[PDB]
Design a protein around this ligand. Structure first.
Ligand SMILES: [Zn+2]
Ligand SMILES: [Zn+2]
Ligand SMILES: [Zn+2]
Lengths: 385, 383, 386
């Protein structure tokens, strides 16, 4: 329908990099057509192109990704690599044409260094200890969008030596890693996690990464792989790390296997980072900090900040995101609790007895260093009564 | 009586009477027209039988339906000058029966505040919809407004900062800014098919028309556990049964416990006419057996409609909703893992202050919006 | 094909010369490599040209009789390259950027053909020897791949390999070249299926017949009919436990009285790791866990559970050898009666346990008591007995 589509498409992808966007959404509707950038978890409408180019745009992208242009009724998935910048494409048949989703994959703005992820010193020591063990299971819990896969990616980079077979099963595979054998799931064809995980055992493996353990079938296989002499990395969506014990048991797993096989259970969430420009002090009462869980001796030296709202923060008061981490090694004391039928709260206490900081405590540490607001800590975490 | 005018008459009269569906029914010795008003069919007209074929054919002409085929069923639509209709013709033994369903998207409420939730219930409903993940199931039978409650949730979340994706069979409301996918199983576009694609496209909120099978249920729940917000419906009696429906389908129990945030259940009841509103002497023993606590039985003021022009002598004008909103509370999660049956769960929910549909119905009765008969008609006592 | 077959041949030959244990053919977005596992560590060996990534893997799939039109889901097969030999098990895995192929060496150097040395418990072995030395009937040895089921099968043939008996065999592929055993290797492309070879055996004045695996109704039906005619039939299936193997055959379409009359025994087995004899350490396992594992409480405290600490001999794994957990279920009158009354799997499992047929879990707990395997290894490999 027109000719300078390639200049338009190139702009939409490039501008997304300049804006440090994480995802691109190209959405056609009956009378409107829009482009949205997801930046720090929030979608902003960027472009409202003319509808005559909607089919020109999608087809230009589909050829870039080796997708069937005649198929506008079923969803398609491919990849795009541009000059050294690759994208992940997903096409979906909206009511009025195909919706396109591109996720930005630039390592340049991806941190693969555990030191730079905001782990506290004591916790990070436990995290490195478990991933460098020669076998066992390491679980990084959290929901989607909590940075949990970034913790995994940084671990694989530390382990990605040419002497070890690292296999990977994700839904979907995001970052193409060199020397790492990544498998994207496809449930319609029978390529489930268990299917790849069973195939991995037939693949002379050393390290195995699983996107998430969602059902008993996958859990059993993943644990037994960690027992057979393999390093198993995976995620679950649990509230805190102590609950991940009774999550696996509620799935139907025998407890003695959980005690023997799990080496570590990380739990983390992402919180908004205050804008460095409209940064304003908030006089929070000391009893409010104590009721939040701050040790009283350190309550006065706290200087709680917040963003007023400016242009740079798009009036959100926040810019980047920041992580609250809980790193709970499977200490001898925790193993005994699992076998005596301990509940979640009982495990939570003994972990804190042994100096295992909760996500709330990690948040109060970020608050003290002045990167997050008091509201954002209470929003994301739960107090440790 | 002219046929074209009469057809327009039966369609317009249905609008004035706020009817939802029109039934044009030929039989061996009679011919009648019925309006669906507040869920109940009333005989409206008894035209002469000679016009049975004239009327149905006129409607088919209005609907662009094959007039040469009177032996097989046909389906179409009508849009007139003011209001669109959905038409279905069915070959009865004695002529064609025609059904028109009124499609009132213009006067359609897509705001949870206008749905008649009681304050406590609405608080739980809002709490669960604004959570960053989890499943919300809106149960009820066909014609219970459950799809209206579902869309009301989407409208509440429909901000430009969130990717709301949707899979329906068929799509009901064409929504702007909502990425809607209409199902097509013959080409392989099932709920499971679209739902798998949604995860690969950076979603925030997902709506699934209905959970009909294990395949869709398992996938939808696992997606809601992964950290996405999933909305769907089922056809179950109350909210507690929706738990053992999912479990009887084959879902692993921890998923039902961990992933579901809330289960709504609803029925529709007639609303008493505001004009012929008369108090009705209901015996107190009847109220206590209905579930009224005896201490509060005298202060109930039971109403009924006498019959006026505005209520079309029905005594009722418009509908009112009886809702049961059961958040997946820590206590109920515990029951699921201990293999509790449905009746046990209903008890613990009621212990924790989750009004049943009967209890919600009696609340509208006390507020003077429903008749006592309409409570007993629609719900079942809690024994 | 000219440079790919040369390259394919190089990858297999160099792997033999370099005494590799596993071969890794790895495609990536812009790179392509082959790694050999030598003494547990992978070394980068070759960096072939990227144009050949799909050509090489596909040729190997042909060498393994693998569907080459299917490049999306994983596949597994075998390769036998002969000498004066070395066979491999191949696995294809659909990476994001093509198919990854892995070859594992199967040298079978330590091969036991003495039923006594397989770790069968005494009561079990007696039941097993009884059925194979019966003059006819069927004996099924079930289990997953890598459970020694074919080793138990061959060990049975060695006990029967006398010069008075016509032993014919149909395998896909033939494993061990046995003297005096008439071995027929399957060749599906030319019509040499199990059923095809099985039919010819009846025309061959047979005594004992071994079939690699009963995977199909055609094969199952005839093999059963052969065991009724007065021939000894040995085969395998991939089933969870011995009682379910009955309802496996029944779901295939076999009439139940045939299963009752023709089956003499159904073995089921799984392999578990053997604790290292050098770093062997006693482990205080809680008693309630043992009772819940299925140990009768009266004998539970006297259990002395071991595990490996980690030494040089065990490569710090704590384990060395393999150990077998066996379930041997003779077709006793009680089980035949259940089969004829349409009993389900759980009922048969119960009645076998009433009749003293130790399950794989129960057999595992005995090896645990004898101090050859760990408690974790019992739970990993077996299933609790309700
Ligand atoms: Zn700012
Ligand atoms: Zn009235
Ligand atoms: Zn050792």
């Amino acid at each position: 329908e027109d000719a300078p589509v390639v200049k338009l498409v190139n702009l939409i992808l490039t501008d997304a990099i300049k804006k440090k966007a994480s995802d691109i959404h190209i959405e056609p509707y009956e009378r409107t057509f829009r482009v949205r950038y997801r930046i720090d978890g929030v979608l902003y409408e960027v472009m409202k192109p003319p509808l005559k180019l909607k089919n020109a745009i999608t087809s230009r992208i589909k050829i870039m990704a080796d997708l069937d242009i005649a198929e506008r009724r079923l969803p398609q998935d491919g990849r795009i690599k541009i000059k050294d910048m690759d994208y992940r494409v997903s096409v979906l048949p909206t009511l009025f044409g195909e919706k396109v989703v591109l996720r930005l994959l630039d390592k340049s703005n991806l941190q693969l260094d555990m030191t730079k992820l905001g782990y506290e010193p004591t916790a990070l020591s436990y995290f490195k200890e478990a991933i460098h063990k020669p076998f066992g299971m390491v679980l990084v819990t959290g929901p989607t969008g909590s940075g949990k896969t970034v913790s995994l990616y940084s671990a694989l980079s530390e382990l990605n030596k040419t002497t070890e077979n690292i296999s990977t099963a994700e839904d979907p595979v995001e970052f193409n890693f060199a020397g790492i054998n990544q498998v994207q799931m496809h449930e319609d064809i029978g390529l489930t996690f268990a299917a790849a995980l069973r195939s991995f055992l037939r693949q002379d493996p050393d390290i195995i990464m699983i996107g998430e353990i969602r059902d008993f079938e996958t859990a059993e296989i993943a644990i037994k792989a960690a027992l057979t002499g393999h390093l198993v990395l995976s995620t679950l969506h649990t509230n805190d790390a102590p609950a991940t014990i009774n999550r696996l048991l509620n799935m139907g797993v025998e407890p003695f296997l959980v005690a023997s096989a799990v080496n570590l259970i990380t739990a983390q969430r992402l919180a908004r980072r205050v804008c460095s420009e409209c940064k304003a002090v908030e006089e929070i009462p000391i009893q409010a900090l104590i009721d939040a869980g701050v040790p009283p001796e350190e309550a006065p030296e706290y200087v709680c900040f917040r963003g007023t709202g400016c242009a740079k923060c798009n009036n959100t008061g926040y810019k980047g995101r920041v992580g609250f981490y809980q790193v709970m090694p499977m200490l001898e004391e925790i193993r005994e609790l699992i076998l005596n039928g301990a509940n979640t709260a009982e495990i939570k206490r003994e972990s804190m007895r042994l100096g295992i900081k909760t996500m709330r405590q990690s948040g109060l540490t970020k608050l003290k260093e002045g990167v997050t607001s008091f509201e954002e800590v209470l929003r994301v975490t739960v107090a440790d009564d």
